[PDB]
Amino acid sequence: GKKVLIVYAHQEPKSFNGSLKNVAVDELSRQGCTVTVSDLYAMNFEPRATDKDITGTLSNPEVFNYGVETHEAYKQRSLASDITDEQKKVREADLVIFQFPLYWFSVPAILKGWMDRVLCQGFAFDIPGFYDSGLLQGKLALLSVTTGGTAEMYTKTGVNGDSRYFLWPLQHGTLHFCGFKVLAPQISFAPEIASEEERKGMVAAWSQRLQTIWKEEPIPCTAHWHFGQ
Amino acid sequence: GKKVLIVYAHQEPKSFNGSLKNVAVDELSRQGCTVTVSDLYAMNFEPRATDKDITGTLSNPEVFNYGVETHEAYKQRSLASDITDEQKKVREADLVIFQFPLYWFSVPAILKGWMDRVLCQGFAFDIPGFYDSGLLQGKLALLSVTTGGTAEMYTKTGVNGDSRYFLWPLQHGTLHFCGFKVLAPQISFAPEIASEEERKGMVAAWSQRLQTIWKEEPIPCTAHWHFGQ
Ligand SMILES: Cc1cc2nc3c(=O)[nH]c(=O)nc-3n(C[C@H](O)[C@H](O)[C@H](O)COP(=O)(O)O)c2cc1C
Ligand SMILES: Cc1cc2nc3c(=O)[nH]c(=O)nc-3n(C[C@H](O)[C@H](O)[C@H](O)COP(=O)(O)O)c2cc1C
Ligand SMILES: COc1ccc2[nH]cc(CCNC(C)=O)c2c1
Ligand SMILES: COc1ccc2[nH]cc(CCNC(C)=O)c2c1
Ligand SMILES: [Zn+2]
Ligand SMILES: [Zn+2]
């Protein structure tokens, strides 16, 4: 049996991102997987890392240290319920798919906020207690990203540089750091500029890939994979 | 004369980030510069990119496209006032300093939200009108980042890889894309693990650098600068 969490960050259900999230639910549900979706915009998910993330009394109310406070709150079961609800979904998942449009070579702020607030010390990693000593080892993660720029722009000699260059903070700095095994990213280039048939083709390629997702090996999440030849 | 905008993202005024922001205000004010600070957490700055960012009739209310709607809203002067207030500060600034702790090899979500919402099409870039032709051409930008990890961890052979690797989405994908000339980053490594004297030393090195900031040349914001080869 297999459980999947899809963390989805798009405002418009009729969007191309919406279509990719819906075909992932459809395909994984067809396989008999247990599927949960965190639709961040529909949840009005809080992105800001603030003292409202800890309930009750702070370890040090005079000098607020977000990392220290959330690490202690996690251990004391005093984190805000929106964070713990997401942590329960991650803890139970075997695969976490992130579905989002690329915003400034990174995730939209609402999804950056999910990463900042949900992946706290004690839950996803400890200090020390990261990368392969991370706490989400055994779990798979996958970035399903859509872009405005064409594939050609995202080549080593292209204006944007290779698409792997922007994946480093997300795949390595975040997912690998927490102990996830990183599956190859799904990059859907320039859907708004594509034809209706080309968009249908991109959606079908993602659905087809999901049919055999449990047979994939993760990428070697190294500097060489992201920046080398 | 010169005008500086400091976009600051830290919850705690007593923090090391707070000390760096304050010494920048002190030094630039001593030089006779005009200084403005956007303290994002104190402003409870909205990070989410939503339809609340447009006040008028949407160009397409049936299928919401944030990029299209904000581009049109910028041209019509129908953007939310919190965005327009930040744009006025950026338009007037000769130098924009971003002061923040590194969160997941990137900016905290509240600051990612400032980038997503403030740097809209029509204001910060256009198509064509990006990279060396970006609309913020002639302006300088500088990232002043603090980290948990030591300098040694942020080297090519270190666990985190070189610090320049994580700068790519911010310096190139965002600042250079909008036409800014990027000054060399100020990276204050591991202040929480440092001694009180070492922290004082990092604050003084930043103040000393600011004394001659107007004499600096920008970096060559290229893939070669960030990744080598
Ligand atoms: C705030 C913002 C920032 C964006 N930044 C990028 C970027 O860095 N690179 C890129 O290729 N496209 C960028 N885009 C374009 C989106 O990635 C693109 O519109 C989206 O992936 C299309 O998918 P959708 O039709 O489902 O929205 C940006 C769009 C917005 C609104
Ligand atoms: C949500 C979160 C994510 C962080 N991610 C990183 C990271 O990617 N790399 C790093 O070296 N430190 C990371 N840190 C540690 C902070 O960068 C560090 O505590 C801060 O820069 C210290 O400055 P301050 O004392 O003024 O807060 C993170 C902290 C938090 C709370
Ligand atoms: C809440 O603190 C966080 C969150 C995510 C993180 N990624 C990297 C670090 C730096 C940790 N430094 C050492 C020496 O262990 C980190 C800290
Ligand atoms: C670094 O590339 C960026 C940064 C911000 C952006 N906002 C919107 C787009 C592209 C939107 N699609 C087209 C081709 O019009 C975009 C690209
Ligand atoms: Zn890695
Ligand atoms: Zn560049």
Q: How far apart are CA A200 and CA A206, in angstroms?
A: 10
Question: Which residue has a Cα nearest atom 3 of ligand 4?
Answer: A104
Atom of ligand 1 nearest to the CA of B115: 1
| Residues sharing a CB contact under 8 Å with residue A170, sequence separation 6 or more, in sequence order | A106, A107, A143, B104
**Cβ atoms within 10 Å, residue A146:** 21
Give the DSSP letter string of A3-72.
Answer: EEEEEE--S-TTSHHHHHHHHHHHHHHHHT-EEEEEETTTTT------GGGB-S--S-SSS--HHHHHHH
Residue A110 CA: distances (Å) to CA of A48, A124, A182: 9, 19, 22
Phi (first) and psi of residue B210, to 5 degrees:
-65, -25
CA B164 to chain centre: 15
- Asked if A41's CB is within 8 angstroms of B165's CB, the reply is no
Q: Which long-range contacts (CB under 8 A, 24 or more apart) does B205-212 make?
A: B206/B20, B206/B23, B206/B24, B206/B144, B207/B23, B207/B24, B207/B26, B207/B27, B210/B23, B210/B24, B210/B27, B210/B28, B210/B31, B211/B27, B211/B31
Q: How far apart are CA B127 and CA A40, in angstroms?
A: 29
Residue A153 structure tokens: 């722009």
Chain B residues whose CB is inside 8 A of the A82 CB are none
Length of chain B: 229
Closest Cα to residue B9, out of B54, B52, B44?
B44
CA of B158 to the centre of ligand 5 (A): 12
Q: Which residues pair with B96 in a beta bridge?
A: B5, B141
At residue A181, the 3 state secondary structure works out as: strand
Q: Give me the domains of chain A, ranges plus CATH numbers.
A: 1-229 (3.40.50.360)
Q: Which long-range contacts (CB under 8 A, 24 or more apart) does A129-135 make?
A: A130/A177, A130/A178, A130/A179, A131/A176, A131/A177, A131/A179, A131/B159, A132/A179, A133/A179, A134/A176, A134/A177, A134/A178, A134/A179, A134/A180, A135/A178, A135/A179
Known binding-site residue numbers of B for substrate: 125-127
CA of A109 to the centre of ligand 6 (A): 22
Tell me which amino acid residue A134 is: G
Q: How far does chain B reach from its first CA to its final CA, in angstroms?
A: 40
Give the strand pairing for A3-8 and A34-39: parallel
Closest Cα to residue B192, out of A75, A66, A61, A130?
A66
What is the radius of gyration, based on Cα positions, of chain A?
Answer: 18
Q: How far apart are CA B147 and CA B153, in angstroms?
A: 11
Chain B residues whose CB is inside 8 A of the A51 CB are 11
Elucidated via? X-ray
Nearest residue in chain B measured CA to CA from A229: B229
Give the DSSP letter string of chain B.
Answer: --EEEEEE--S-TTSHHHHHHHHHHHHHHHTT-EEEEEEHHHHT------GGGB-S--S-SSS--HHHHHHHHHHHT-B-HHHHHHHHHHHH-SEEEEEEE-BTTB--HHHHHHHHHHS-BTTTB-SS--GGG-TTTT-EEEEEEE-SS-TTTTSTTSTT--HHHHHHHHIIIIIITTTPEEPPPEEE--TTTS-HHHHHHHHHHHHHHHHTGGGPPPP--SHHHHH--
Q: Widest CA span of chain B, in angstroms?
A: 59
Q: Return the C-alpha torsion angle B161, B113, A206, A4, nearest 10.
A: 80
Give the DSSP letter string of A115-161.
Answer: HHHHS-BTTTB-SS--GGG-TTTT-EEEEEEE-SS-GGGGSTTSTT-
Q: How far apart are CA B36 and CA B31, in angstroms?
A: 14
Residue B96 structure tokens: 């924009």
* Residues within 5 A (CB) of ion ligand 6: B 172, 176, 221
Torsional class of B49: left (φ above 0), alpha (ψ -120 to 50), beta (otherwise): beta
Answer for the pair B126, B80: CB distance below 8 angstroms, yes or no. Answer: no
Exposed e or buried b per residue across B192-213, where buried means at least 16 C-beta atoms within 10 angstroms of its C-beta:
eebeeeebeebbeebbebbeeb
Q: How far apart are CA B181 and CA B183, in angstroms?
A: 7
Atom of ligand 1 nearest to the CA of A188: 21
Closest Cα to residue A114, out of A29, A19, A56, A178?
A178
Chain A residues whose CB is inside 8 A of the B113 CB are 47, 109
Residues with CB under 6 A from ligand 2: A 49, 66-67, 116, 173; B 10, 15-17, 101-105, 146-149, 191-192
Resolution in A: 1.5
| Residues sharing a CB contact under 8 Å with residue B227, sequence separation 6 or more, in sequence order | A165, A227, B164, B165, B168
Q: Which residues pair with B143 in a beta bridge?
A: B98
